[PDB]
Structure 1
Amino acid sequence: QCQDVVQDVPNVDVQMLELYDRMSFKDIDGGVWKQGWNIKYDPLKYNAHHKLKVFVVPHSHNDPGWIQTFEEYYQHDTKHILSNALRHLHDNPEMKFIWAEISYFARFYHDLGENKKLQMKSIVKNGQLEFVTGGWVMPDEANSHWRNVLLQLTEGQTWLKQFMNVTPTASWAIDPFGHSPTMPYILQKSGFKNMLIQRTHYSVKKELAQQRQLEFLWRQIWDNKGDTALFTHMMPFYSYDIPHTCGPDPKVCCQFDFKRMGSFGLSCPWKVPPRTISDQNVAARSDLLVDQWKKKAELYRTNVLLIPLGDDFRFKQNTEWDVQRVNYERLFEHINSQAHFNVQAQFGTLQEYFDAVHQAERAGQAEFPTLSGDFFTYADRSDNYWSGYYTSRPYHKRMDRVLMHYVRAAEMLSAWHSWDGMARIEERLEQARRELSLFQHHDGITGTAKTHVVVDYEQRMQEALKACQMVMQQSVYRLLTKPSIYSPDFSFSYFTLDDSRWPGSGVEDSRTTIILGEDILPSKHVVMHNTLPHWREQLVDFYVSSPFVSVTDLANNPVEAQVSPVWSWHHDTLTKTIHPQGSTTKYRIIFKARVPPMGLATYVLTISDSKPEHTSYASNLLLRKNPTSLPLGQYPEDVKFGDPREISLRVGNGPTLAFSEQGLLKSIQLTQDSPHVPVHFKFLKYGVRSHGDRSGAYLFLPNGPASPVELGQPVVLVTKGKLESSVSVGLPSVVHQTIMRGGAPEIRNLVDIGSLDNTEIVMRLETHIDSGDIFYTDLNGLQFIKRRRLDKLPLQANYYPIPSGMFIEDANTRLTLLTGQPLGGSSLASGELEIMQDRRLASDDERGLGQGVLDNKPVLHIYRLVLEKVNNCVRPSKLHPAGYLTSAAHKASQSLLDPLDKFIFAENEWIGAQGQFGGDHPSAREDLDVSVMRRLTKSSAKTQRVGYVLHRTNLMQCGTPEEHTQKLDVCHLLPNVARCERTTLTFLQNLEHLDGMVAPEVCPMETAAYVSSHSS
């Protein structure tokens, strides 16, 4: 049983945090290898009995959207590459080619007639065309949530298994801008044996190369045993293009990119063109090329050398296939027949390279170092750190996380039944999974694509959201209607989703108001869904046409509720203030919903002509100089006014929060007797450099530390209710809201950077926590890694991805900020946290995009802020590279990422309505999640199969006694189980047939997958 992930510091050869603390970072001219040194080799190292085995691996990097849309690239480029690949590989048996992006391959394959399909299958079966990774895309590693990394891998690999009968075990990640250990975590659990990465900091490449530590067994930071390890190969040079893959001198290597001789437009920037290989020059050319290979081979431990051969959208023209193939074949024939070289070179695939390396390891020829850590933040040269894309296009970053939840919910809700083909459930789920998967591309969620490409991704994600809504609402109808009364029309809307936080108040008026009245419809059913495997209570809110509404459950038990006005903010260009207006026609009703594990609960809203017994009304206070009245229609309590002043609020037994006269948090007091702890929000802006390198979509190159946003005298709105209170303030570019429901506050920022060109807006938290230079940021929502601010690095290098959370702590106190969207952030001084909200850049940053970022739109960012006493917690030691959340902070993260879903019944009467679904579902331990529940079979299959992915996090022990909980056995969630198997995380390979058809729960920090089979 389980590894302790807290108290044992793993012993690794390279631990990236420790290596950063020691490493120099000096940007020194290394010669032809600009960022390295002049490599020397011993010519007698290789001989008749010990030859350098060189695998030249043709490839073509195909971005599913970047400068053109996916479909534009497919029509203009990729359909040709793949057509020509099919023809040339089929005609040339020794030619090889690897392919990464299954989205394009599936797009292609489904346009192929049978003859070509058969031909394609044959070049895959004979090993000439090899799929690497096999994901739908090559995902970003900074902003992506691990659940979506696994989704897009499963989408591509399930397609490959079904249509090509192959499952890749080698991964190829040549382009994401920095690399995360979440990848080997997911890959290793999905049957992978090896992986290749490229974009790591040039200083790290030089450091590892010096020690021949470019190939290593990459384990997770908390892994003491090393069972998570995956063999990784890091490429050594500046790019994956031909000039940077043959050896250390690009002026030489460029001469062996035969597409650069003129007729393809392309040329060599180092001024020496390739020349066709002939008998008159083959010897000289071979000398040149082998010398480059033998230099590159010096950086590695075995006698097996990987030479990628490709670049972006290569192998497009038939003439290009011929010019590369024929010229390399001429080199290989000469080189391999010249004993004096002691080289055997051939086209290969990636798996061939790794198979050969491991054969060399097994022969005792090499031992490999172990490594843990991550590879952020990347810089490709000088002080050009790629921390800009941790925030770029934040509207779509947030939309990613919204779609993530709705895909999970729709797959889970619809999994409980088998559906007739006419329902189109599988079709809709496939479309949603594929649009979300596509967006995980390293120019998708990263916000590094052209404006019109961003719009395409946005439209596709909008379609996905609608598809999820359709599936979820049909599922709810079926799950909550008496079976003998259930009468579906599969094109009808029984329920509409109500989402309070997307697109968000002030972003879009998309919420429907429930219209009730004594003379018309008196009442309305609403339904909440809880995707998490434990009972959950959460305040939910609805818009209603009257303030006089009562809430009941479906046993007619009253439910305590609170009504508040609907407040919207407007840039009142008449008075030149950002101020709130109250609705006179609709109101917000809020109540606590309690919902079963992975289940549903129905409530009823009912109108009355006066105040209901169990409904209370918020008070409202507008703090501003020179106030004017704010009428609220029928709302029964008048708004109060006041001059700006410090205020204090407390909901329930929860913390007391104090606010500045500018409506920004100043302090938090946890309990009535405890101290008021300074926690101050502030908004600042970064600018761009006037001379030298410009920030763009990719790069963050600030012109110095951020300067405070001048606030003036902003308007502050205070709402005080029994269930929920809030302070909102209209600041320049940001409506900032602090919401209190009785535990950790929620923060919402409506961010509209307007036409503030060349500006980045940051939210900072200033505390007196003595964190020093240490802080913690998450990786892909999966784990928290210790960061150390280094003064030897510039500010932008100390920015990291914040895909779900960050924290600082000292011996007694921790401040944790959870996010509902991936953004960039740091701790730039002891006691501070900061997180970038948006950025508007009018300049290109010279990484191939050819535009700045000037397509900003209002976005509602959501957060939770958790202040905790941690002197009693059992924490890792100072040398441990991980941190872990407390239970409160983990639940707060879950509240942002997987909130209850809300449905409003769309017609007047719901005949056969039921009160609950899932009351008998086990309520699992709080650290356990069912990350995926997906039915894997269509309704015609005699044996139905459902897949589950279980993930258990690790939470800090802080002395709260553990409650009794029920064991979750996913294999018994559906009736008539006939088998339970443990599988790889993609569901594609059976790993263990389970005794008694019981799926065991998993250890802390482990993730497992199970498939239950059912007789149907």
Structure 2
Amino acid sequence: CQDVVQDVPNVDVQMLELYDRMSFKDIDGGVWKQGWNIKYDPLKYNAHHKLKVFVVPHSHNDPGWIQTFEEYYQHDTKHILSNALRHLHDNPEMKFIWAEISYFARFYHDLGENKKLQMKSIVKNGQLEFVTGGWVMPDEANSHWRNVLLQLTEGQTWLKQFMNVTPTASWAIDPFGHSPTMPYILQKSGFKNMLIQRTHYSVKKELAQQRQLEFLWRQIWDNKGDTALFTHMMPFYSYDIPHTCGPDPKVCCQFDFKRMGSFGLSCPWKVPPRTISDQNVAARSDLLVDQWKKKAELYRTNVLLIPLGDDFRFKQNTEWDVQRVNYERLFEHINSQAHFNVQAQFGTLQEYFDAVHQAERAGQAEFPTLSGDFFTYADRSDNYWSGYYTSRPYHKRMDRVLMHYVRAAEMLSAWHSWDGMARIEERLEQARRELSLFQHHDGITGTAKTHVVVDYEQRMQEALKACQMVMQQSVYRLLTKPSIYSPDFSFSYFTLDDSRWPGSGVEDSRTTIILGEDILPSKHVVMHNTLPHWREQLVDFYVSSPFVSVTDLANNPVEAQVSPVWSWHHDTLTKTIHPQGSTTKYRIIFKARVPPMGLATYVLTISDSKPEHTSYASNLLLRKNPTSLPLGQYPEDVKFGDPREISLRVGNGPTLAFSEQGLLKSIQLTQDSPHVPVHFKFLKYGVRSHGDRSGAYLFLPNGPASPVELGQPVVLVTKGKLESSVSVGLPSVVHQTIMRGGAPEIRNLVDIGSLDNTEIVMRLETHIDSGDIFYTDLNGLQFIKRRRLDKLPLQANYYPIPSGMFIEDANTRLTLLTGQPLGGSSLASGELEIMQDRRLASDDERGLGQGVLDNKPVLHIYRLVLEKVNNCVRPSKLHPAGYLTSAAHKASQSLLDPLDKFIFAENEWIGAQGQFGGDHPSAREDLDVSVMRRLTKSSAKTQRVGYVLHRTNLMQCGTPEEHTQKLDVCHLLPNVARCERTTLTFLQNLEHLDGMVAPEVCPMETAAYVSSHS
């Protein structure tokens, strides 16, 4: 295994180093506004060395943006695809590329058999070629790597089944900035080439000057280069026709034949296209070939890529004709005029890359190596696209909840083969497709119109209901004696209980377990653990009495804590934000212990008085002018007091001190250690009154943030043996710090209300001497080093925080893990900050046509980990990566993949069992089974089950941490007959495994295996 910590890779371009050296001046470069006047030697190309030009027709189809997916399919995409089939069938030399498989599958299934056969023929003969082949062209900033793989697999599995092809070239022309997580996943899924477009205009200028726009993109920790993927970066401002034929858009626009008038389009540079004739073909070819030779100067081979397309193009039959016939006249002239030394033709993306590598093998070019990312993107001036790292935060959090429910539903139902009548495959396919659709670059990014955001929410709600159904039918089958098991596949045997989604204060969705001497004395509950190691975690349920005790299924008592159910209200009469307690529902909390990828059953029983093994929390309400707070049967009366500083400690854990406003002030790790200053603060950013305005994509603050005026907020303190917390009602945010014995959990109920043109940020202030360095993650896969640059504006120093961020000095580290992707930065030494929500009245000129005024309450969750790191073996100063400690990685897993909770729905569960999975191996803490999925239906003689195994890399800081068991996924199901290593999409077998044993992977590696069973 390669050492991902101690060896700094040697690459030609390292993006953090490039950023430190570049000036980023925005000067007028001439007709190529952000470049320079390109010059070329006409003698470079000649009879023995011609320029080969591939014009590649394409149509960018967004799966929702200004219209919903179905509205665009009906108004535009079904006509584009129907006319592509007719035109390619009738014109054998015409070509076309297609990226979004969600639309293609929606079209194909509605076609008659004759047309399905015609479509398969133009794919088999190479005229219509699929690029990437994912369900969508995903966002690369907020998306989790697990969902980028899920949508890639959904589209490529459909393509293999119905079109018999698997793309090896990727096309990503519209995501707002680019992530190395893409070549990581693509290279492990059979790809050989990829293309990107939206990178900072200063970066395109710098790389073009050095002819470094084509490069071997490897991971930042990869010393050997085995992760490398050939990448082509487009050079200009847009992927549209005016910015794809060459450097001068006033010239290129004249070669977009849809812009002469009858289609309602024109050229903003004021010179229109003109129909090619025998009297003007020579002068038009002279202008076009000059643009092509200028573009060719920016690259190393004699093969040139010329995309020809735009949004929802190639719709009308007349449009197909106007572009094809005019280009065919240009090619016939150009290719017959020897003085140009050019051979031009329509081509596909794979054809371009195959010709580039033929040139490389002929020794005509060598390519540079590169590592790093391409965030944060700016397309012009100071217009940095960091706003979408936060826009529509409710749906960003919903993405992570659904991510976990799809994993748990596929894993729980994979253990058995299911009758078709159970509709398991049907519900899982719907769930995978709705979550895959939301990975689109106007979905999770929060950049679609209001009614489109509603469509994505409705689709994800249906996906959550599908997951719940599959999960609860699976738990009933896994924990019921086989000869008693009697399923009704439409029945609800268990209901899921989720404490953090939609969350307290967002939706009253949780069911109370109703017990009573005159109705039901007890209730079974079951916990599932999707991770491959034994896990303990506190769990809570709402119950109708405080006198409840817990037992495991051997009837052993389990220690429990009961607390009140508190809800916060904006009292429009007293003009205060304060908590009200329930006098009939209570929370019971206890530690559940669950096997690796397994289930554990517990029982809740009522008694007439306080049970021996259940304790009750105390509650203290701090505010001036208090009024009584009755709690029905709860045995401890609420106490009151004026605001004051307070300190709390649960278990042997850290001791936390809070200000009289209920915000963290310091953390003391041990009995003896110092009280380290760690302060939470809420602030607000505004919008500029003149110039460009912030919107769904852009963050254009009117200066540094100003503190939110807090007034004298109401603070609630609950102190218990197993769990304690401090909660405070601040303007727009109910802020809560929860302690269970380790790093605290932070929850913010954020309601920006009617505060227009405001962005609310949560900042941490410390005295850690971090200087200008901080770390953020990429897609929940890896941590990359960031350097704050004062030569760039505040918004350029904002980066995506898809799952975590940290700052450190020689001795101390502060890590903030998140349960949802948000935007953030470190704007000064010792600080971390992350945006909570943003409400904007204006549109930001990127096509959305509205502001963001549809905010709704959202419950954000986090873990805050303060640690000493002086003993950890860390990368050297020049290494571009960082790595988490064991405690920080487990804290991230507690947020993204918590235990699942099920409440038995009827009065008596006949045949109930106590545990499932006690014999599953408990794997080392850095290893995860990211995906477990049965790949065959019940009628297959040979069953197949696929697994994706990921190992992260944790710092060695002196903790022995030993004895774990080897995890061989191929022997998790009985009667294994074969074990194969496959691509990550499970579509190609790469290795037949000896002894049917699947080896574990190396740190930072991801592998896929399929076991076959007789």
Q: Same fold (TM over 0.5)?
A: yes
Separation (CA, whole Å) in 1 of partners of 2:867 and 2:551: 35
User: 1:447, CA displacement in angstroms?
Assistant: 0.2
Match of 2:726 in 1: 727
Separation (CA, whole Å) in 1 of partners of 2:18 and 2:517: 71
Separation (CA, whole Å) in 2 of partners of 1:830 and 1:602: 48
Q: Tell me the alpha carbon deviations over residues 861-902 of structure 1, each in whole angstroms, 9 at most, x when there is no partner.
A: 000000000000000001000000000000000000000000
SS state at 1:991 partner: strand
Q: Tell me the alpha carbon deviations over residues 938-980 of structure 1, each in whole angstroms, 9 at most, x when there is no partner.
A: 0000000000000000001100003111000000000110000
SS state at 1:513 partner: coil
Q: Tell me the alpha carbon deviations over residues 279-303 of structure 1, each in whole angstroms, 9 at most, x when there is no partner.
A: 0110011010000000000000000
SS state at 1:116 partner: helix
Match of 2:20 in 1: 21
Separation (CA, whole Å) in 2 of partners of 1:99 and 1:654: 55
SS state at 2:396 partner: helix
Separation (CA, whole Å) in 2 of partners of 1:741 and 1:317: 63
Separation (CA, whole Å) in 1 of partners of 2:217 and 2:281: 40
Separation (CA, whole Å) in 1 of partners of 2:241 and 2:658: 58
SS state at 1:263 partner: coil
Q: Tell me the alpha carbon deviations over residues 879-934 of structure 1, each in whole angstroms, 9 at most, x when there is no partner.
A: 00000000000000000000000000000000000000000000000000000000
Separation (CA, whole Å) in 2 of partners of 1:845 and 1:428: 39
Separation (CA, whole Å) in 2 of partners of 1:263 and 1:619: 75
Residues 869-888 of structure 1 aligned to structure 2 (within 5 Å): 869-888=868-887
Separation (CA, whole Å) in 2 of partners of 1:412 and 1:679: 40
Separation (CA, whole Å) in 1 of partners of 2:782 and 2:39: 41
SS state at 1:381 partner: coil
Moved over 2 A (4+): none
Separation (CA, whole Å) in 2 of partners of 1:915 and 1:854: 49
**Structure 2, unpaired ranges of 5+:** none
Q: Tell me the alpha carbon deviations over residues 521-574 of structure 1, each in whole angstroms, 9 at most, x when there is no partner.
A: 000000000000000000000000000000010000100000000000000111
Residues 567-578 of structure 1 aligned to structure 2 (within 5 Å): 567-578=566-577
Q: Tell me the alpha carbon deviations over residues 723-782 of structure 1, each in whole angstroms, 9 at most, x when there is no partner.
A: 000000000000000000000000000000000000000000000000000000000000
User: 1:6, CA displacement in angstroms?
Assistant: 0.3
> What is the number of equivalent residue pairs in this alignment?
1014
User: 1:23, CA displacement in angstroms?
Assistant: 0.4
Q: Tell me the alpha carbon deviations over residues 837-856 of structure 1, each in whole angstroms, 9 at most, x when there is no partner.
A: 00000000000000000000
Separation (CA, whole Å) in 2 of partners of 1:629 and 1:25: 61
SS state at 2:379 partner: strand
Match of 2:778 in 1: 779
User: 1:660, CA displacement in angstroms?
Assistant: 0.4
User: 1:60, CA displacement in angstroms?
Assistant: 0.2
Q: Tell me the alpha carbon deviations over residues 786-814 of structure 1, each in whole angstroms, 9 at most, x when there is no partner.
A: 00000000000000000000000000000
Separation (CA, whole Å) in 2 of partners of 1:45 and 1:913: 80
Separation (CA, whole Å) in 2 of partners of 1:330 and 1:111: 36
Separation (CA, whole Å) in 2 of partners of 1:769 and 1:263: 64
1:292 aligns with 2:291: yes
1:150 aligns with 2:153: no
SS state at 1:678 partner: strand
Separation (CA, whole Å) in 1 of partners of 2:884 and 2:94: 51
User: 1:403, CA displacement in angstroms?
Assistant: 0.1
1:931 aligns with 2:930: yes
SS state at 1:379 partner: coil
Q: Tell me the alpha carbon deviations over residues 327-362 of structure 1, each in whole angstroms, 9 at most, x when there is no partner.
A: 001101111111010010100000000000000000
Separation (CA, whole Å) in 2 of partners of 1:803 and 1:8: 27
Separation (CA, whole Å) in 1 of partners of 2:663 and 2:278: 77
User: 1:47, CA displacement in angstroms?
Assistant: 0.4
Q: Tell me the alpha carbon deviations over residues 449-490 of structure 1, each in whole angstroms, 9 at most, x when there is no partner.
A: 000000000000000000000000000000000000000000
Separation (CA, whole Å) in 1 of partners of 2:557 and 2:340: 87
Separation (CA, whole Å) in 1 of partners of 2:833 and 2:117: 55
Match of 2:589 in 1: 590
User: 1:518, CA displacement in angstroms?
Assistant: 1.4
User: 1:378, CA displacement in angstroms?
Assistant: 0.2
Separation (CA, whole Å) in 2 of partners of 1:287 and 1:488: 75
Separation (CA, whole Å) in 1 of partners of 2:607 and 2:378: 63
Q: Tell me the alpha carbon deviations over residues 138-164 of structure 1, each in whole angstroms, 9 at most, x when there is no partner.
A: 000000000000000000000000000
Match of 1:678 in 2: 677
User: 1:181, CA displacement in angstroms?
Assistant: 0.2
SS state at 2:768 partner: coil
Q: Tell me the alpha carbon deviations over residues 703-723 of structure 1, each in whole angstroms, 9 at most, x when there is no partner.
A: 000000000000000000000
Separation (CA, whole Å) in 2 of partners of 1:371 and 1:681: 38
Q: Tell me the alpha carbon deviations over residues 235-266 of structure 1, each in whole angstroms, 9 at most, x when there is no partner.
A: 00000000000000000000000000011101
Match of 2:905 in 1: 906
**Once the two structures are aligned, what percentage of the paired residues are identical?**
100
Match of 2:550 in 1: 551
User: 1:520, CA displacement in angstroms?
Assistant: 1.3
SS state at 1:987 partner: coil
| TM-score, structure 1 as length reference | 1.00
Separation (CA, whole Å) in 2 of partners of 1:196 and 1:914: 53
Separation (CA, whole Å) in 2 of partners of 1:866 and 1:996: 43
Separation (CA, whole Å) in 2 of partners of 1:55 and 1:887: 51
Residues 116-131 of structure 1 aligned to structure 2 (within 5 Å): 116-131=115-130
SS state at 2:890 partner: helix
SS state at 1:490 partner: coil
Match of 2:706 in 1: 707
Separation (CA, whole Å) in 1 of partners of 2:748 and 2:262: 53
Separation (CA, whole Å) in 1 of partners of 2:430 and 2:948: 21
Separation (CA, whole Å) in 1 of partners of 2:738 and 2:48: 73
Separation (CA, whole Å) in 2 of partners of 1:644 and 1:343: 80
Q: Tell me the alpha carbon deviations over residues 156-201 of structure 1, each in whole angstroms, 9 at most, x when there is no partner.
A: 0000000000000000000000000000000000000000000000
Q: Tell me the alpha carbon deviations over residues 664-684 of structure 1, each in whole angstroms, 9 at most, x when there is no partner.
A: 000000000011000000000
Q: Tell me the alpha carbon deviations over residues 391-418 of structure 1, each in whole angstroms, 9 at most, x when there is no partner.
A: 0000000000000000000000000000
1:824 aligns with 2:823: yes
Separation (CA, whole Å) in 1 of partners of 2:331 and 2:632: 84
Q: Tell me the alpha carbon deviations over residues 403-458 of structure 1, each in whole angstroms, 9 at most, x when there is no partner.
A: 00000000000000000000000000000000000000000000000000000000
Separation (CA, whole Å) in 2 of partners of 1:33 and 1:629: 71
Separation (CA, whole Å) in 2 of partners of 1:258 and 1:769: 60
SS state at 1:929 partner: strand
Separation (CA, whole Å) in 2 of partners of 1:817 and 1:770: 17
Q: Tell me the alpha carbon deviations over residues 305-332 of structure 1, each in whole angstroms, 9 at most, x when there is no partner.
A: 0000000000000000000000001101
SS state at 1:398 partner: helix
Separation (CA, whole Å) in 1 of partners of 2:611 and 2:796: 57
Residues 523-672 of structure 1 aligned to structure 2 (within 5 Å): 523-672=522-671
Separation (CA, whole Å) in 1 of partners of 2:805 and 2:865: 11
Separation (CA, whole Å) in 2 of partners of 1:334 and 1:613: 94
Match of 1:68 in 2: 67
Residues 90-129 of structure 1 aligned to structure 2 (within 5 Å): 90-129=89-128
SS state at 1:563 partner: strand
SS state at 1:514 partner: coil
SS state at 1:697 partner: coil
Separation (CA, whole Å) in 2 of partners of 1:905 and 1:465: 19
Match of 2:858 in 1: 859
User: 1:519, CA displacement in angstroms?
Assistant: 1.6
User: 1:575, CA displacement in angstroms?
Assistant: 1.2
